[PDB]
A paper describes a structure:
Terminal uridylyl transferase ([name]) is one type of enzyme that modifies RNA molecules by facilitating the post-transcriptional addition of uridyl ribonucleotides to their 3′ ends. Recent researches have reported that Drosophila [name], [name], exhibits an intrinsic preference for RNA substrates ending in 3′G, distinguishing it from any other known TUTases. Through this unique feature, [name] plays a crucial role as the repressor in the biogenesis pathway of splicing-derived mirtron pre-miRNAs. The structure of [name] contains two canonical globular domains separated by a large catalytic groove, which serves to accommodate the 3′ ends of the target RNAs for the post-transcriptional addition of uridyl ribonucleotides.
Numbering used by the authors: 200 to 550
The structure:
């Protein structure tokens, strides 16, 4: 659509970008760090167990917290994501929820509804990942409750990445806020652009390929959720041979300029963002042959569950390798993102 005219960067974004990088982080980073762990979360998880256990007597029940609060890029308005594991379902993968999973979520709904400690906000059973959205009234924190473990698994990977290489965390706080000010979150999520930051830094030799953390040998076995390897070697970057930078304003600004310039000129027709492989120029035409043998076997028995590559923008989840997290980005949404990237890189320059 008017592909010959650049989509103008929104003024709400422009003001943030041309304003000092300091003001971006002065409050936001300390807040995000603090929100990795606060006692409110223990209250939420204790209340969730007490609420739901009677509904599932004799089954084990464990609560796993995840999402932006837990990884260190949240703010006070952020939700908290919770995987409720009833009956040791952690290692079970369902690309689309099973009838059994849906029946469980439907049963859980009335508990939040009847309970005075919880306000039911929405019940979403048609999504790829069905969720219950509910406010925990004693803390006021909005919670997304799901029934599979993949988000928790990628949260733990992000936490390792952010703690090892804090530049990654600063960059993700910045680009999260940039997406919001650009009004792009309908199309590109915080998690998607987090994977884009990770991939970009892998290309700079500042983060390992995820595949390199998941070598399967005598010393290292996989934790499998269905066909997906969800654990990783928690090696020091010293051992990996990767330098660990101190995030300063000038360091952050230079890496952000290069991030936006890179994705402004990325060839989305032929290549995908691929933190699994962590190397430059990963071809859409080749990725499905570059994955572990479990992927090929999984698609054989689930032929409609292969990664969706016939899409404008391909960003592959590094653990759930059949998931293009940007599969809903349209041609015009991608043009908009590219144009906003181009204009942001321009405003971060300083000859």
């Amino acid at each position: 659509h008017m592909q010959h005219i650049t989509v103008r960067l929104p003024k709400k974004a422009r003001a943030m970008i041309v304003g000092e990088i300091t003001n971006v982080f002065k409050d936001k980073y300390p807040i995000a760090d603090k929100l990795k762990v606060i006692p409110e979360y223990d209250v939420i998880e204790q209340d969730l167990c007490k609420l739901l256990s009677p509904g599932f007597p004799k089954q084990p029940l464990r609560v796993y917290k995840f999402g932006s609060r837990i990884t260190g890029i949240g703010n006070r308005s952020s939700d908290l994501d919770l995987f409720v594991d009833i009956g040791n379902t952690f290692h079970t993968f369902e690309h689309r929820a099973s009838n059994a999973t849906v029946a469980k979520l439907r049963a859980m709904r009335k508990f939040f509804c009847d309970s005075e400690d919880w306000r039911l906000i929405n019940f979403i059973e048609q999504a790829r990942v069905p969720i219950i959205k509910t406010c925990h009234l004693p803390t006021g924190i909005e919670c997304d409750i799901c029934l599979n473990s993949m988000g928790f698994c990628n949260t733990n990977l992000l936490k390792y990445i952010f703690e090892s290489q804090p530049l990654t965390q600063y960059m993700c706080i910045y680009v999260k806020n940039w997406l919001e000010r650009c009004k792009l979150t309908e199309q590109i999520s915080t998690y998607s652009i987090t994977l884009m930051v990770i991939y970009f830094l892998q290309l700079q030799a500042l983060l390992p390929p995820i595949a390199m953390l998941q070598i399967e040998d005598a010393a290292n076995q996989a934790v499998l959720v269905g066909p997906w390897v969800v654990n990783f070697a928690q090696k020091s970057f010293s051992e990996l041979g990767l330098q660990q930078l101190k995030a300063t304003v000038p360091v952050i600004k230079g890496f952000l300029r290069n991030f936006f310039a890179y994705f402004a000129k990325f060839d989305y027709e032929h290549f995908l963002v691929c933190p699994y492989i962590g190397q430059a120029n990963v071809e859409i035409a080749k990725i499905e042959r570059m994955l572990h043998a479990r992927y090929s076997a999984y698609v054989s028995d689930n032929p409609e569950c292969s990664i969706q590559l016939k899409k404008p923008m391909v960003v592959q989840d590094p653990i759930q390798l059949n998931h293009n997290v940007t599969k809903a980005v349209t041609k015009y949404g991608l043009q908009t993102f590219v144009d906003y990237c181009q204009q942001t890189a321009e405003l971060l320059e300083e000859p």
